[PDB]
Amino acid sequence: ELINMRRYRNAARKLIHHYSLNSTSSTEYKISDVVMTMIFLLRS
Amino acid sequence: ELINMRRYRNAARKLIHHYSLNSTSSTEYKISDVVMTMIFLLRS
Amino acid sequence: LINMRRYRNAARKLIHHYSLNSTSSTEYKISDVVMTMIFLLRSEKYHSLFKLLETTFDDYTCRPQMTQVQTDTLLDAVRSLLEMTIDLTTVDIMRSSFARCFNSPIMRYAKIVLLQNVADKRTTLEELLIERGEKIQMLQPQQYINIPFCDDAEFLNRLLKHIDPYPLSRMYYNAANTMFYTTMENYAVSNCKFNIEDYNNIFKVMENIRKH
Amino acid sequence: LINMRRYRNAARKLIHHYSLNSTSSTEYKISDVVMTMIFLLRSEKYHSLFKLLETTFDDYTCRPQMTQVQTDTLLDAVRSLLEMTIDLTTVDIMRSSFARCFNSPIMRYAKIVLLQNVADKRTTLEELLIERGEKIQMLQPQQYINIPFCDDAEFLNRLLKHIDPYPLSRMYYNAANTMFYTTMENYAVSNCKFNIEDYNNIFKVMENIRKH
Amino acid sequence: NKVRTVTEIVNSDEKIQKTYELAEFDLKNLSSLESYETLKIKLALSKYMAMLSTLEMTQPLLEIFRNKADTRQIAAVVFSTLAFIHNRFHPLVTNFTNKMEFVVTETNDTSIPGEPILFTENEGVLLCSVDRPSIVKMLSREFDTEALVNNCNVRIAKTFGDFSITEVEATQYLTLLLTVEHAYLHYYIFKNYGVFEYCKSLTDHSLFTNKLRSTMSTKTSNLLLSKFKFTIEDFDKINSNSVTSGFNIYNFNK
Amino acid sequence: KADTRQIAAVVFSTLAFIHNRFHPLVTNFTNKMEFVVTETNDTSIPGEPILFTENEGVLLCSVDRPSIVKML
Numbered sequence: 001e002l003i004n005m006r007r008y009r010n011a012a013r014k015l016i017h018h019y020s021l022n023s024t025s026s027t028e029y030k031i032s033d034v035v036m037t038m039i040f041l042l043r044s
Numbered sequence: 045e046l047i048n049m050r051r052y053r054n055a056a057r058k059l060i061h062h063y064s065l066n067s068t069s070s071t072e073y074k075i076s077d078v079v080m081t082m083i084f085l086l087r088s
Numbered sequence: 089l090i091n092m093r094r095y096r097n098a099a100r101k102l103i104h105h106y107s108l109n110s111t112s113s114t115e116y117k118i119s120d121v122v123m124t125m126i127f128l129l130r131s132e133k134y135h136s137l138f139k140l141l142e143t144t145f146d147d148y149t150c151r152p153q154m155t156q157v158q159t160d161t162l163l164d165a166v167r168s169l170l171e172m173t174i175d176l177t178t179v180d181i182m183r184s185s186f187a188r189c190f191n192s193p194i195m196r197y198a199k200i201v202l203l204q205n206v207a208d209k210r211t212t213l214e215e216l217l218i219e220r221g222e223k224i225q226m227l228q229p230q231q232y233i234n235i236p237f238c239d240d241a242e243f244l245n246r247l248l249k250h251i252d253p254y255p256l257s258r259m260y261y262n263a264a265n266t267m268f269y270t271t272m273e274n275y276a277v278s279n280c281k282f283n284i285e286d287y288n289n290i291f292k293v294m295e296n297i298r299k300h
Numbered sequence: 301l302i303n304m305r306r307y308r309n310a311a312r313k314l315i316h317h318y319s320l321n322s323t324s325s326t327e328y329k330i331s332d333v334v335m336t337m338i339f340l341l342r343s344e345k346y347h348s349l350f351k352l353l354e355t356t357f358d359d360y361t362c363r364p365q366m367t368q369v370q371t372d373t374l375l376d377a378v379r380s381l382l383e384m385t386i387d388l389t390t391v392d393i394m395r396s397s398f399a400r401c402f403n404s405p406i407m408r409y410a411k412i413v414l415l416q417n418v419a420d421k422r423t424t425l426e427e428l429l430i431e432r433g434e435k436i437q438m439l440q441p442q443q444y445i446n447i448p449f450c451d452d453a454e455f456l457n458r459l460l461k462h463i464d465p466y467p468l469s470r471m472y473y474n475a476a477n478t479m480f481y482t483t484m485e486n487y488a489v490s491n492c493k494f495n496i497e498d499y500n501n502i503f504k505v506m507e508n509i510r511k512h
Numbered sequence: 513n514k515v516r517t518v519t520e521i522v523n524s525d526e527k528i529q530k531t532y533e534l535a536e537f538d539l540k541n542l543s544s545l546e547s548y549e550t551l552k553i554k555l556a557l558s559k560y561m562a563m564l565s566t567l568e569m570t571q572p573l574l575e576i577f578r579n580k581a582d583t584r585q586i587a588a589v590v591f592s593t594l595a596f597i598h599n600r601f602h603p604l605v606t607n608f609t610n611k612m613e614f615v616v617t618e619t620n621d622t623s624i625p626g627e628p629i630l631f632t633e634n635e636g637v638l639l640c641s642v643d644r645p646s647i648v649k650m651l652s653r654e655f656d657t658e659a660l661v662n663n664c665n666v667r668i669a670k671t672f673g674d675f676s677i678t679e680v681e682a683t684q685y686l687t688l689l690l691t692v693e694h695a696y697l698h699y700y701i702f703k704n705y706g707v708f709e710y711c712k713s714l715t716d717h718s719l720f721t722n723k724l725r726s727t728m729s730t731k732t733s734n735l736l737l738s739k740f741k742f743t744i745e746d747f748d749k750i751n752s753n754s755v756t757s758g759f760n761i762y763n764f765n766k
Numbered sequence: 767k768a769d770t771r772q773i774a775a776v777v778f779s780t781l782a783f784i785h786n787r788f789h790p791l792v793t794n795f796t797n798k799m800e801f802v803v804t805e806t807n808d809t810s811i812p813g814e815p816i817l818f819t820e821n822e823g824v825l826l827c828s829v830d831r832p833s834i835v836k837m838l
Contacts, residue, residue, distance in 0.1 A: 026676040027570040066805045067770065068227040214664040216812065218671040223809035224828050225821065229800035231774035235782050235793055270837045274812035287813075322654035385652070412746035425715050428625065435622035436641050437634065441613035443587035447595050447606055448566045449559070459558035460551075462677050467661065468550050471679070472740050474655040475687040480744075482650045486625035496750060498717050499626075502694075503742040504765050505720040510738040512729035672819045 003043050011036035047087050055080035095127035100169060106185035107178050108203070108273055109170065111265040115198060121189060134169070136162045140179070144187035151183065177277055180206045202284070203276040211280050307339035312381060318397035319390050320415070320485055321382065323477040327410060333401060346381070348374045352391070356399035363395065389489055392418045414496070415488040423492050553739050556600070557682065560689055563596055564589070570675070573684045574651040577644060580618065587614035590629065590642055593692040594699070601700075601732045612638040618645060627714060629695035631702055650691070651684045686736075693736050697724070718765045767805065767831070774801035777816065777829055799825040805832060 015037045018025060059073055059081040098120045104110040128138035136158060143149050154162070159176070166182075167174050184205050192199060268287070275282035310332045316322040340350035348370060355361050366374070371388070378394075379386050396417050404411060480499070487494035515532045542548055569576065569589055576585050595608035613634075617623055624630055628643040628650075657679050701723050702710035713719050744750070782795035800821075804810055811817055815830040815837075 022676075024674075024676045026572070026681075028572055028575065066227065067767070068230065068802065070223075070226050071228065072226060213812070214668055217668045218664075220809045220811055221668070221671040221819075224802065224804070224817070225819065225826075227802050227804070227809070229802040229826060230770040231801045232798075233774070233778055233801070234798045235779065235786075235795065237783070237786060237793060266837050270815075270833055271813040273836070274810065274833060277807060278810070278812045280812050282812075316654065320653075322656070324654070324656040324659065384654075412749060414750060425625070429711065429714060432622045432624055433632075436615065436617070436630070437632065437639075439615050439617070439622070441615040441639060442583040443614045444611075445587070445591055445614070446611045447592065447599075447608065448563065449596070449599060449606060450562055450566050451559070452562065455562055456555065456558050458674070459561055459677075460554055462675070463554050463558060463682055466554075466679050466682055468553055469661045469740065470656070470659070471683045471686050473661055474657075474683045475690055476737075476740075476742050478650050478653050478655070478687055479691060481653065482628075482646055483626040485649070486623065486646060489620060490623070490625045492625050494625075496744060496747070497754065498715075500744055500747060501716075501718045501765060502720075503737075505717060505724075506735060506737045507741055508721045508765060509724055509729060509735055512725050673822070 003039065005040070005043060008036055008040035008043065012040040047083065049084070049087060052080055052084035052087065056084035090126060090130065092127070092130070095123040095130075096169075099124035099127045103166075103182065104170060106189070107166075107170075107174075107182045108269050109172070109174075109178065111262055111269065113265075118194065133161075133165055137165060140183060141186045144183060144190055147187070147191065177207070177273075181273065181276075202282060203272050207277045207279055209279055211278070213280060213283070216278060216280050302338060302342065304339070304342070307335040307342075308381075311336035311339045315378075315394065316382060318401070319378075319382075319386075319394045320481050321384070321386075321390065323474055323481065325477075330406065345373075345377055349377060352395060353398045356395060356402055359399070359403065389419070389485075393485065393488075414494060415484050419489045419491055421491055423490070425492060425495070428490060428492050549739070553736070556736065557686060557689070560593070560596055561677070561685060563592060564685075565675075567592055572681055573688055574648070577648045577651060580644070583614070583616050586616060586642060586644065589688075590614065590640065590692065593688060594640075594696055597689075597693055597696045601696075601728065609638060612640060614640050614642060617641055617643045620645075627695070627698070628691060630714075631695070631699045631710070633707060647688070647691070650687055655680055655683050657683075690736055700724075721765050770801070770803050773803060773829060773831065777801065777827065781827075796825060799827060801827050801829060804828055804830045807832075 011033055015025075015029060015033055018029065055077050059077050062070060062073065101112070101114065102116055102120045102124045104112065105114070105116065125138070125141070128134045128141065136154070139152060140162070143152060162179070163174060163176075166179065181203065184203070187205075188201060271287065272282055313324070313326065314328055314332045314336045316324065317326070317328065337350070337353070340346045340353065348366070351364060352374070355364060374391070375386060375388075378391065393415065396415070399417075400413060483499065484494055513534045515534060517530050517532065518527050519529075520527050564570070567588065569585070569592070571585075573589070576589055579585065591608065591612070591614070595606075598608050599606060623643050623646065624641075628646040630641040632639050632641070697720055698710065698713060701713045701719070705723060709719070709723070713723075778795065778799070778801070782793075785795050786793060810830050810833065811828075815833040817828040819826050819828070
């Protein structure tokens with residue numbers, strides 16, 4: 001399986017939480033993180 | 045159903061209570077809220 | 089056997105003072121407390137009030153749970169006792185006053201206190217000024233204003249004749265005590281520290297104003 | 301029956317302070333200790349931590365033997381309680397802090413202490429300087445260096461706008477207390493005497509520096 | 513603007529006259545404003561953040577120090593902070609020491625309790641030690657961000673009348689800046705008075721007042737740690753363990 | 767509660783009477799001012815039942831009706 005579903009989880013949260021917690025973000029995260037989250041949501 | 049009866053009840057209660065106590069606008073209720081309240085009263 | 093009428097009168101007077109519904113300053117003794125409690129117990133329709141005030145003996149035992157009909161009935165009972173408006177905050181004032189009276193020790197000289205422990209948010213005057221402040225501007229005004237001072241000698245003479253028998257000092261006492269009690273009750277209800285330095289400085293300002 | 305939420309909050313705050321994971325200086329009372337211990341006992345997955353801190357009642361009874369899985373589980377439990385890194389030395393700090401809190405007598409004024417009794421080799425600053433000193437030179441450096449100070453007025457204006465609402469005094473307090481706590485924890489962990497004369501003389505040096 | 517004063521005595525018509533220049537009083541008044549000093553400190557911090565930003569160092573400092581693998585970023589951050597502090601002391605040199613090496617420490621076994629950034633000479637080049645876990649523990653510690661440290665009237669009158677930098681990030685920046693400031697004071701004594709004096713200062717910070725006030729107190733700006741007077745709570749009680757029946761004739765540090 | 771005009775007129779007349787007592791030359795008070803009546807504790811000032819404020823356009827006077835009712 002290409003997707004490491006476990007690692008793809010945390011990411012989502014991190015942002016999902018992070019974004020839900022704080023509308024705006026900063027350098028803290030990456031485009032890699034966004035891709036990770038979206039791929040997780042697709043797979044689940 | 046077009047009407048979210050719960051939210052409509054909430055808004056109607058807010059405005060009616062507000063008006064049940066005073067006799068003014070108290071400008072954080074917005075025309076919408078009126079509309080919300082009146083629609084709730086119609087539906088109920 | 090007890091005299092219902094005397095006990096009822098003592099209860100009426102003591103509750104009038106302890107509810108801040110009257111400015112009548114009569115020296116109250118322990119006997120009046122005994123009479124008011126006994127009358128509250130004996131009268132069937134004042135049982136709710138008697139239990140409410142008796143729960144104040146221990147600070148850890150707080151107000152009994154009453155459904156809305158019970159609170160309304162107790163309000164009607166208090167209104168009938170006072171024959172007078174009266175609402176929940178009056179009951180809170182009475183509860184606090186009787187609690188402080190009961191927990192106070194027997195002593196030879198009357199203890200002078202201020203209203204406290206009524207109505208979480210312990211605030212001061214300035215935060216209330218700001219906060220309630222806007223809640224005010226939030227409201228739109230009702231009336232827009234955009235003056236006869238008649239000196240009709242006969243009319244003022246008749247008005248003075250009507251007012252002449254009134255003991256001006258008593259009127260001033262009543263007005264001043266009423267303002268003081270309303271201010272204190274608003275402070276205590278709003279959970280704001282009542283700074284009697286400022287209130288006494290008001291009178292000091294008047295006194296200093298006169299002599300110049 | 302007890303309120304799990306209030307006890308959990310009190311435990312969280314008291315453990316945050318007693319683990320030196322936070323600079324929040326809130327006056328802690330005996331009630332907070334009672335709540336944290338009761339919550340630790342009641343919660344099933346904090347039983348290891350509760351037993352660990354309860355063993356501190358007697359100085360002669362030391363830490364219970366835990367296999368690696370148990371230590372890892374307790375670390376996860378502490379992390380969950382704090383929702384934050386956390387490792388064994390944090391647990392050692394907590395054990396020492398709770399031991400000193402428990403063995404302390406009931407007293408009217410808060411007792412101010414410094415971290416001690418954590419982590420054989422009782423050393424001083426100079427021997428550590430020498431010793432660790434070489435262990436440093438032993439390591440080879442990673443990077444070789446062999447500078448823009450832009451004054452973009454608009455950019456500094458935006459940065460100041462972002463920083464303006466921050467209460468500078470609070471930031472200074474947080475930074476200074478963080479440095480102090482890190483230094484104290486490094487001293488205690490290294491089993492080196494923390495000379496607060498020198499640390500206070502740092503501030504005295506700053507004060508003497510300013511006025512010239 | 514100038515203000516003139518005249519003194520006249522009752523024995524004659526003589527008048528002695530002095531001219532005062534108001535700019536001195538205006539400067540004192542400006543230096544007495546709380547907002548002015550707050551603006552100065554916040555502007556120094558903003559310049560530090562801008563300097564980091566133009567060096568790509570936009571990631572939060574805690575995240576930079578949490579990355580074990582990438583040492584180049586840590587070395588660049590520490591070097592840039594040292595250079596910024598050096599320029600603050602000497603506003604004529606934009607480039608720090610042209611050549612110096614960095615070693616990152618990840619172990620307690622080789623860690624200095626209280627001086628996370630240390631300097632040494634390997635007989636060929638300056639070497640700087642960075643205690644990464646110490647800085648990580650500093651920046652990752654939870655901060656008191658709701659308590660108030662001690663005007664309501666102006667607020668009352670008003671009531672009657674895009675990089676996302678949180679407070680935690682700004683506090684982290686200030687923490688690192690102060691730490692590197694302490695390290696730079698040690699390094700300044702090193703470079704200007706020898707290794708012997710540097711290792712003497714490492715065990716006794718009280719020599720800073722003598723080795724800084726001779727040159728820095730009259731030539732450079734104010735130090736960041738001098739913005740507030742810091743004291744240890746109940747310092748006398750804890751210090752009671754070490755009390756001397758003293759006789760101080762060289763109390764060079766009050 | 768319903769008739770606010772009478773309350774506003776009473777408060778304005780009392781203010782004008784006091785102003786004339788202080789300055790026995792001006793019979794008309796501030797020619798334009800607005801009134802807002804308060805019926806809630808949530809927006810009540812503990813000890814100053816009548817308060818004044820500027821809405822950047824005109825004087826505004828606050829009247830705490832339950833406080834005055836409790837007084838009288």
